[PDB]
Each structure stands twice: as C-alpha cells, then as structure tokens.
Amino acid sequence: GKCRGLRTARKLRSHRRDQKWHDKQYKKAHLGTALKANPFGGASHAKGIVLEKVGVEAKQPNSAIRKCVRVQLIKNGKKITAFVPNDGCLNFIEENDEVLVAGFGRKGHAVGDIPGVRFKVVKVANVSLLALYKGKKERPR
Amino acid sequence: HGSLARVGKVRGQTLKVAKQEKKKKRTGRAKRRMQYNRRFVNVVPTFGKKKGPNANS
Amino acid sequence: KEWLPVTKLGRLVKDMKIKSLEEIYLFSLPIKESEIIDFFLGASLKDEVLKIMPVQKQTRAGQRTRFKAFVAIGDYNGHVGLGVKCSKEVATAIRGAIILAKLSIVPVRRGYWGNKIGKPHTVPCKVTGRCGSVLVRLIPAPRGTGIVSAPVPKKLLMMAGIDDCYTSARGCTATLGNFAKATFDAISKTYSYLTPDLWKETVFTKSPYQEFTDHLVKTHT
Amino acid sequence: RELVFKEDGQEYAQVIKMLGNGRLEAMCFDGVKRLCHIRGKLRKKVWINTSDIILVGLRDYQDNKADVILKYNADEARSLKAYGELPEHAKINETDTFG
Amino acid sequence: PVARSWVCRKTYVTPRRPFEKSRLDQELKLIGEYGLRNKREVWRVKFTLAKIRKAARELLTLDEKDPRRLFEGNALLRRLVRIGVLDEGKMKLDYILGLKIEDFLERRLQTQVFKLGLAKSIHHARVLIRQRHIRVRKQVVNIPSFIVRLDSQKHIDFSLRSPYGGGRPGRVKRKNAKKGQGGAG
RNA sequence: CUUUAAAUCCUUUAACGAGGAUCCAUUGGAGGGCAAGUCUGGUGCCAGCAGCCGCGGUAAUUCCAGCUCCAAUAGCGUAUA
C-alpha cells in the first residue's frame, strides 16, 4: 500500500479494480471475446463428426509425424483439428462418424511437439478408445 | 519396411506372449500386514545406502 | 585415532580443564579445531547430506567439473551446524563438508508459546535471517504442533532439536544452499536477541586462560 | 551400395522444386503431385538437388503429403532406366556430380 | 419440498504431500502395529485430533475467568476423561495439546480385545469382532472402530450366541459331526 | 417372523452355503519433480511416449509385451469452471 489515510478507501478500491483489470487471466476470464473465439464455448467436452484423416509433423527437435483428424463441432460448426491420442487408433476411427472430443490439458493451447492442435478424441461412435485399445469391448458395425 | 504411413507397426509386430497363471494377491487388510512385515520386521541393519525393493543389479 | 593439539584451546580441552563447550560459546573463542566438538559431543552428533551439486569452470580444452556438498550436522538437544566444501571428487568433498560443518556450530535457545510449563519446545520469539534473496522467518508454535516448512529447513530444525515452528519463506527458495544458510542464520541469532528474561547484568567470570596460565606455561614453550 | 526395390505403398519420384523448410514437391510416375516431407535421417548427411530420381512413400488414408525415403546415384538411375520399370517418356536429362 | 436430512460432512483429510518417505513410513508403522485396513482410518483420527486441538487452542487464546472458557474447557476435559485418553492428574487445558495419535488409538475396541487376552493377534481381534463374537453390557458388537469408555472396560466378555463363550456350535462343527456319523455308519 | 394402507429393505430366525476358501480387486505408474528394476525380448528419430524438462539414430533405466515392484483401495484416471 502507498496511499495510507484513514478516509481513503474509494481510491484504493478503484486503483485495485483497475490494476486487477489490467491482467491476463482475469482479463481472459471476464471478457466475452475469448469465449466468442472459443470453439467449445466454455465447455469441457464437445461432439463432432469426422471430415478426413490428415497428418502433421512434429517440431524441430523431435522427428515424427503425428496423425490428427479433422472434426468440425456440432454446436456451432467450427472446423477444428483434433489429435487421435494413442497408437494404432486411426484404424478404429472412420470418415463421417461421430466422435467425442475434449481438450488436451493446457486450457486451450498446444502441448509439446504437436503444432497448433490442442484437442484429443476420447470416444468414437459412442464407445471409448480405451475399450478398443485394451481388448475389453468391440465397436459396432 | 513396406510403408511409413502404416500405423501400429510395433503393436502389430510385437511377439505376443500370453500371461502365465500366478497365485492371487492378498488385498484389503492383509497386504498392509505383508508390507509392514517385509519393510519393518525381518530387516537387517545395513550400512552405506539402502537398496530399493526392485534393485535387481 | 590420535590427536596432537596445535592450539592452546585444544590443549585446554584435552587436559580435562574446560568443563563444557558453553563457556567457550560464552567468551566467543574461535574454535579452529574440529575435534573439540567431537570430544564434547559424542555419538549423538548425527549427520546427513542435503545436496551434492556440480559446478563447472570451463577451460580451453573442455570444461573442468567440481562437486560441492551441502552437509548439516547437529545434536538433537541444542547445537546445530552447517558446512559447504567444494573439492575434486565427492567423498573428500563430503569429508570436507563434515569438518567445515563441525567447525561452524552454534547453540540455540528454546522458549514457550503463551504458557511456561515443562521443557521448552519452540523458538522464544519471531527471529529472521537473510542471505542472498532468501528471507526465512521462525515463529513460535503451540505444543504438539510440529514443524511446517519445506523439507530442508524441517530437517534442519529437527536436528536443531526444536519440536514446534511456524515458517514463511520468500525469494528463490529452490537454491538449497542459500535456503539452508538463511535458515541457519535465522536460527543462529537467537542469542543475538535481547529479551527481558535476562535484563540483569551478567557477572564477569574470568577466562579459562586467567586460571590455567600456570598449566599452559608448564605445557608450552 | 545395394539395389533396393520398392514395395506396396512406395514409388519413385523426380524433384521439381528444391524448396526450404524441409519440404519439397515431386511428381509421381503418372504426374500426380505429392508434397514431399523429407525423412529425419536425410536432413544433413545427404543433399537432394533438383531433377533427380528419389524414393518416396505413399499414404493409405489421404493424398495430400508424402515422405521421401531414399536417393539413388546417376549410374544406378540409368541402370534402372535400362531395365524398363518406367515408360519411354521420362528423360533424366544428364544429371550427375561435377569434378 | 421433501422432508429429508441433507446434512453430511467428511470425517477425514488428505495431506498436501502425497509422496514423502517419513510420512508413509509412519502411517505404515501405525497400520501394521495396530492392525488397521487403510490410511483413511489414521487420516480420520488425525482429523478429529486436529479438531480437538483446534478447539483447545481456541479456548486457550480466550482470556482467563470467563464462563465460556470454563464451560467448554471442563466439557472437553470431562469428555476426554470419559474416553480414557487422560487421567484426573492431568486435568488441565494446556495438557490437551500434549496428546498423541497413540492415545486415541489405544482406546479402540480391537486394541482392547487384543490387550485383555480375548484374541492372540490384533488382526485376529479384528476378524473376531467381524464374525460377531465380542459383546459388552449385553449387546454384541460387530465393528472394530468402537470407542470404549473408562467404565465400559470391565464388561468385555464373549457373547451368549458365539460358540467361543458357550452356545450353538458353528458350521464346521456340525458338518464334521455329520461326516463322522457318515463314516461310522 | 417382523415392517407397511399393501409390500420391499434392515434386524431376528430356520434348513443348506469355502483351502488354489475360482465366492480369484481394479485404476494408474515405475529418468527427475514424486513413492517404485540401469530385468528380459521386438521396432530402430519409424511406430509411438511425455501436464514440464525431454525419451526414440540396429546395446531405449521413458515406445510395445512377460516377471517383479510402488501409490490409493471399492475405488482410480482424464477434460474443463
């Protein structure tokens, strides 16, 4: 505190309000432009169906290609790119099929060597990818 | 080699070894008893540094 | 398993004349011999290592590496010490940390929270030390609470012997050497704080030299 | 060194533009263009010039971007031309190393 | 507007440090010494001991010679005497904070069954309580986390329906008797 | 038998009801943070793992499998405010 007076609270409150407004997390969490530009619309999960299966490489130090998928969302038709999570799961996902897609764990940012993408697929055709992985349940066809 | 865009080569070329039958593991309260016994009851005093429970060197 | 005391203090300690180390702390003699504390404090002086980190000075042909070991030693009923030694290998760095920590050892005082019943268990007041950018507070706690801190000052105050503390650190805490030296400096200055419990004027007892000058002129040149 | 042959999922290619960012574009034998992204083991040790025969794999899920596998010297290129695994339309136009 | 309770609370707390050597060694020592099932029990004993210590500290920070201090202090001391974790010699408010998890753990029914001599081990005491063999003041107890009071210590004996203290023999006795009748003809 | 408007469930109580007591406990992890193998085979900057540093280049303490081990335990992991 700098202005310390017995009859000074409105000045302190207004200055604290302005300096709290002039932030990053509070400015993102209390403005509508971020949620308007948010594809999920401030939600944990979203549905979508598959446009096509594409491939993108990694960054400079790591040399591999990561096989994401192109899914557009159902709430508002935003076309995003979601990363198919685990090994060999690109056979299970098909073109024009419903998927359940969630974030990857950095509040809407790219994670590691994958470029730009920030979402992952959790379930395809209302069955989980973990059940298709561990040999516990078979997908309908 | 075949191709590079093929997926699951390591999973599709893994030498599939089935699990062998083992005796069931005690669970609930007896596992805490066995852990307490093997960590605090039949231990010998040791100098230097203590090896881990899986140090198979 | 041998000792040749090169100093006058070593000869006085060896010849069964100076009773404890408390009067040596009282007159504030520089203890330039390591094994005076070994002779006074026996097997209760337990040691452990804090961190062995490498430092590198680069030369024309590659870079030369040295290892420095932070080691704290102390007795669980009072005295605590801390020592840093940088050498070539690791084992003699640990031994150098042992000898330099046993050189630099200080006593602590313990007080009470609120009520004075039984043995003292916590720090007498709010004491604070500082080295680098690290600021460490030691605040008294009620009986039976326990030390709440990072693990390194927690083990430092347990080897100090205090049962109850409240702490609040600030700065680059991850530098373990600066944090350990700041906690050691915070706990070392408890005898540098004046309290109304000891406002009375201390009677000036004589130095052990003043009574053992005859013994030292018999045993020395 | 050795005469490597292709397999199901790979074909040959001829470089059209030698481009930056670790990528280029090369034709197939029928003229379809696949965006070649170079393999990680062929980034600094070997160097790929313009209008030379290379080995480029294909994709089993899309046709938008391919990957380079290997490169061949000029003598083995004209030896592969002499066998007749490619039609009589493609000309190497005398590419080799200088002296 | 249904007429229900909607009142509940958590009785245990989880420490902020999940992986430390000395903490896991201490709870493993407590569990293996006193034959408990999981760390949720010692966590809930730590929680109720922290609540009692917080209440005693809140009473100690209030000034002397006040009716609320005396009322809740004497209520807490009478309660902890009734549990049996204290004696009448240490009947003081500042002596509450010098307690331990050990004193709250000795008052378990499982510990008293093992200590008096009904059972041979603490785990045998637990499984002996679980099969309904131990009764106190003419009421059987099937649960190991029962806190016995100081006056309830001398009433511990075997049940009138358990075969250990006199009653109908169990399933293996009658089956082995029928097997002996079949073998004898 | 009891409960209940009539029931169900709890408790009481019959006759049956276990020795690999198959009446078989999962969820994550094992480089550091952070508790726990420089174990054994396969791929060889490919497939992939990894919240972060980073691990994969034909001897991988990190990929994929077997054994052992660690964490919480009828619960555990993940995405979001």
Nearest to D55, CA basis, from D45, D63, D42: D42
Contact of A55 with chain D, judged by CB distance below 8 Å, is answered with yes
3-state class percentages of chain A: helix first, strand second, coil last, to nearest 5: 20, 25, 55
**What is the rounded CA–CA span in Å between residue C102 and residue C21?**
13
Phi, psi of A108 (to 5 degrees): 95, 50
Q: Where are the alpha helices (DSSP H) in chain A?
A: 10-21, 25-29, 32-36, 129-133
Backbone angles phi, psi at D71, to 5 degrees: -135, 155
In this complex, do D10 and B3 lie within 8 Å of one another by their Cβ atoms?
yes
Q: Other CB atoms closer than 10 Å to residue E29's CB: what's the count? A: 13
CA distance A89 to B11: 11
Whole-angstrom distance, CA of residue E158 vs CA of residue E137: 11
| Selection from E19, C134, C192 nearest residue C153 by Cα | C134
The backbone torsions φ and ψ at residue E48, rounded to the nearest 5 degrees and listed phi first, read: -75, -30
CA distance C163 to C144: 8
The token pair that represents A81 in the structure block:
């790119």
Amino acid, single-letter form, for residue E123: H
Q: How far apart are the first and last CA of chain B?
A: 36
In terms of residue numbers, what domain contains D33?
A: 1-99
Residue identified by tokens 């009620």 is C142
Question: Computed from CA positions of residues D18, D20, D26, D32, in that sequence, does the dihedral angle turn out positive or negative?
Answer: negative
Please give the tally of structural domains in chain D. Answer: 1
Angstroms from D71 CA to nearest CA on chain B: 16
Taking CA atoms, C130 is separated from C82, C173, D57, in Å, by 15, 12, 64
The domain spanning residue C77 has which CATH number?
Answer: 3.30.160.20
Distance in Å from F44's C1' to B2's CA comes to: 15
C73 burial via Cβ count (<10 Å: 0-12, 13-18, 19+): buried
> For the range D92-95, what are the long-range contacts, defined as Cβ-Cβ under 8 Å and sequence gap of 24 or more?
D92/D51, D92/D53, D93/D51, D95/D49, D95/D51, D95/D52
Specify the 3-state DSSP secondary structure of A58: coil
Cα separation, C167 vs E126, whole angstroms: 41
In single-letter form, the type of residue at position C165 comes to C
For C79, list phi and psi in degrees, rounded to 5. Answer: -65, 140
Residue C122's beta-bridge partner residues?
A: C111, C164
Could you give the strand order of the β-sheet that contains C165-170, starting from the edge strand earlier in sequence? C127-131, C134-139, C165-170, C147-148
In this complex, the residue of B28, B33, B40 whose CB is nearest that of residue E29 is B40
Which residues of B fall below an 8 Å CB-CB distance to D? 1-6
Q: Which tokens go with D17?
A: 């533009």
End-to-end CA distance of chain D: give it in Å, rounded: 21
- CA–CA dist C36, C209 (Å, integer): 17
Q: How far is the CA of E20 from the C1' of F47 (A)?
A: 37
| C59: its two tokens | 């030369």
Length of chain B: 57
Give the CA dihedral E171, E175, E180, E183, nearest 10 degrees. Answer: -170
Contact D66, D59 (CB under 8 A): yes
Taking alpha carbons only, the member of D58, D73, D52 closest to residue D7 is D58
Domain ranges of chain E: 18-185
Tokens of E32: 């293996």
**Looking at strand F, which nucleotides approach a protein CB closer than 7 A?**
13-14, 16-18, 20-22, 24-25, 27-28, 30, 34-39, 41-57, 63-74, 78-81
User: Encoding tokens for residue C90?
Assistant: 């690791």
Cβ pair C82, C91 in contact under 8 A = no
Most distant pair of Cα atoms in chain C: their distance:
66
DSSP notation for B3-56 = -SS-S-HHHHSS---PPPP-PPPP-TTHHHHHHHHHHHTSPPP--S----TT--
Interatomic distance D40 CA / F77 C1' (Å): 35
Distance CA E72, CA E114 (A): 34
Contact C80, C64 (CB under 8 A): no
Residue C217 CB neighbours (<10 A): 9
Do residues C105 and C79 lie in contact, with contact meaning Cβ atoms separated by under 8 Å?
yes
Is D42 buried (19+), middle (13-18) or exposed (0-12) by CB count in 10 A?
middle
**C-alpha closest to that of A129 among A97, A89, A72, A94:** A89
Q: Are strands A119-124 and A98-103 parallel, antiparallel or unpaired?
A: antiparallel
Contact E28 B33 (CB under 8 A): no
In whole angstroms, give the CA distance from residue C75 to residue C41.
8
Resolution of the coordinates in A?
A: 3.7
What distance in Å separates the CA atoms of residue C173 and residue C151, rounded to the nearest whole number?
Answer: 12
Taking residue E15's Cβ as centre, other Cβ atoms within 10 Å add up to 11
- What amino acid is encoded at B44 in this protein? V
Pairing of strands A119-124, A79-83: parallel
Beta-strand relationship, D65-71 and D33-37: parallel
Whether E60 sits inside 8 A of C151 (CB atoms) is: no
How many Cα neighbours within 13 Å face the side chain of B30? Answer: 6
Provide the experimental method for this PDB entry.
Answer: cryo-EM
CB neighbour list of residue D46: distance below 8 Å, 6 or more residues apart = D71
CA-nearest of D73, D70, D26, D69 to D51 is D26
Q: How many CA atoms lie within 13 A of B18 on its CB side?
A: 2
For residue C203, the distance in angstroms to the closest alpha carbon of chain E comes to: 36
**Across chain E, which distance is largest between two alpha carbons, in Å?**
84
Parent domain of A113: 1-141
Do residue D40 and residue A63 have CB atoms under 8 angstroms apart? yes
Ramachandran sector of residue A132 (left: φ over 0; alpha: ψ -120 to 50; beta: rest): alpha
* E32–B36 CB contact, under 8 Å: yes
CA distance E89 to chain C (A): 15
Burial environment of residue E32 by CB neighbours within 10 A (0 to 12, 13 to 18, 19 or more) = buried
Three-class secondary structure of residue E104 per DSSP: helix
| Three-state secondary structure string covering C51-71 | EEEEEEEECCCCEEEEEEEEE
Question: CA gyration radius for chain B?
Answer: 21
CA gap A44, A25 in Å, rounded: 18
Residue E138 structure tokens: 């003419």
Q: Determine the number of helices (DSSP H) and then strands (DSSP E) in chain A.
A: 4, 8
Do E93 and E56 touch, CB atoms closer than 8 A? yes
- Chain D: residue whose CA lies nearest to A67: D61
| CA neighbor of C34 nearest in space, from C97, C108, C107 | C97
Nearest-angstrom CA–CA distance, D63 and C96? 67
CB E135 within 8 A of CB E166: no
Number of domains in chain A: 1
Residue keyed to tokens 């192109």 = A70
Identify whether the C-beta of residue C101 lies closer than 8 Å to the C-beta of residue C75. no
Q: What is the dihedral of CA E158, E160, E165, E168, to 10 degrees?
A: -140
- In Å, how far are A48, C214, E96, E100 from E49, measured between CA atoms? 52, 62, 10, 8
Q: Give the separation between CA C43 and CA C83, rounded to whole angstroms.
A: 19
Q: Which of C104, C108, C110, C109 is nearest to C181 (CA)?
A: C104
Helices (H), chain E: 21-34, 39-60, 67-83, 101-105, 109-116, 122-130, 171-184
